[PDB]
């Protein structure tokens, strides 16, 4: 009776109720090109799209019909792609389907774990991964940025982490801009963002800017992530910025503020450091130059002892170097009992 269902039946897809996988009379590429040329040739050419999507949304007012429309299809002659993905293969419908799809996602914030343990929102965003071609790669970007800004915490975390399978290789820079803008905005989403940004394509200059940008915010991070963030800074350290970044870290970190709760998290921290410095030599000599070069201020902190001990325990080329430095320090009236 609806334009949508009739065009779908002629074009060669079986629309089932919504409980089991929709059957398919025809090949998918054949189907796609058939409905493409059908809608091309059909009169009221610009308005059939509107009529098509209005029929679609009126069909998907019921959950289960859309749930089967979202799910992977049945080949009769045996398991296929989803109709939404295949239908999104056609450029003319694409921005509209995206509009609709995203428009109706906020229905599912609060109805979590209904039937088959399936996170509908995860599924719908999973529909967009790995697309052949986006009619707009900038419209999708703006729409996912509205979405990413708004969602509750878990869902935000989920869709974000889903970004690189989604995006091609063009609309990276604007995402970068927006994410760094979100990063100064919200401290909660450092980790998954920093993960994302190591996976996308950026200018080195941008990396370094966000680095200084996270590290200014370094006191402002709850403990749990503090580990993984330094992890980032010191996998991401270049050879040349080494002593500045170390100096900044060395300044900004405390080993005093945090403190079963404090100690376990600190311990993990020192592990993460042990790794970084075990597996990269230049941090060590650079690190000591960055205490030795700060001979000036009598006032140097807990970190600095803890770190000399540690490096003596590890790479042993430095032992003589640590000892002369630790003597020069003690005689100089810096380093003392308290």
């Amino acid at each position: 009776d609806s334009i949508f269902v009739k065009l779908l039946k002629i074009s060669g897809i079986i629309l089932k109720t919504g409980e089991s996988q929709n059957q398919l009379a025809v090949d998918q590429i054949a189907f796609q090109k058939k409905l493409f040329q059908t809608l091309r040739r059909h009169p009221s050419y610009p308005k059939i799209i509107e009529e098509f999507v209005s029929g679609l949304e009126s069909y998907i007012e019921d959950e289960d019909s859309f749930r089967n429309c979202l799910l992977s299809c049945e080949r009769l002659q045996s398991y296929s792609k989803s109709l939404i993905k295949l239908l999104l293969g056609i450029d003319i419908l694409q921005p509209a389907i995206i509009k609709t799809l995203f428009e109706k996602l906020p229905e599912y914030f609060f109805e979590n774990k209904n039937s088959d343990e399936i996170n509908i929102p995860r599924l719908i965003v999973s529909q967009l991964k790995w697309l052949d071609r986006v009619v707009d790669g900038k419209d999708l970007t703006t729409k996912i940025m509205q979405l990413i800004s708004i969602a509750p915490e878990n869902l935000q975390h989920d869709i974000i982490t889903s970004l690189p399978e989604i995006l091609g290789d063009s609309q990276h820079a604007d995402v970068g801009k927006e994410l760094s803008d979100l990063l100064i905005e919200n401290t909660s989403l450092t980790v998954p963002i920093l993960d994302v940004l190591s996976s996308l394509r950026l200018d080195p200059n941008f990396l370094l800017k966000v680095r200084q940008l996270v590290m200014d915010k370094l006191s402002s991070i709850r403990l749990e992530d503090l580990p993984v963030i330094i992890k980032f800074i010191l996998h991401s350290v270049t050879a040349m910025d080494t002593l500045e970044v170390i100096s900044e870290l060395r300044e900004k970190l405390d080993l005093q503020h945090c403190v079963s709760s404090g100690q376990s998290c600190i311990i993990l921290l020192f592990d993460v450091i042990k790794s970084a410095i075990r597996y990269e030599k230049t941090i060590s000599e650079a690190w000591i130059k960055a205490i030795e070069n700060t001979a000036s201020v009598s006032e140097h902190k807990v970190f600095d002892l803890v770190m000399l001990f540690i490096i003596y325990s590890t790479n042993t080329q430095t032992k003589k170097y640590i000892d002369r430095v630790l003597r020069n320090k003690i005689r100089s009236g810096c380093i003392q009992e308290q």
């Binding site: 401290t187 200014d216 915010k217 402002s220 991070i221 503020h257």
Partner: peptide
């Protein structure tokens, strides 16, 4: 001008 220190929070 930016988020609090861990301390303050």
């Amino acid at each position: 001008t930016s988020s609090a220190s861990r301390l303050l929070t």
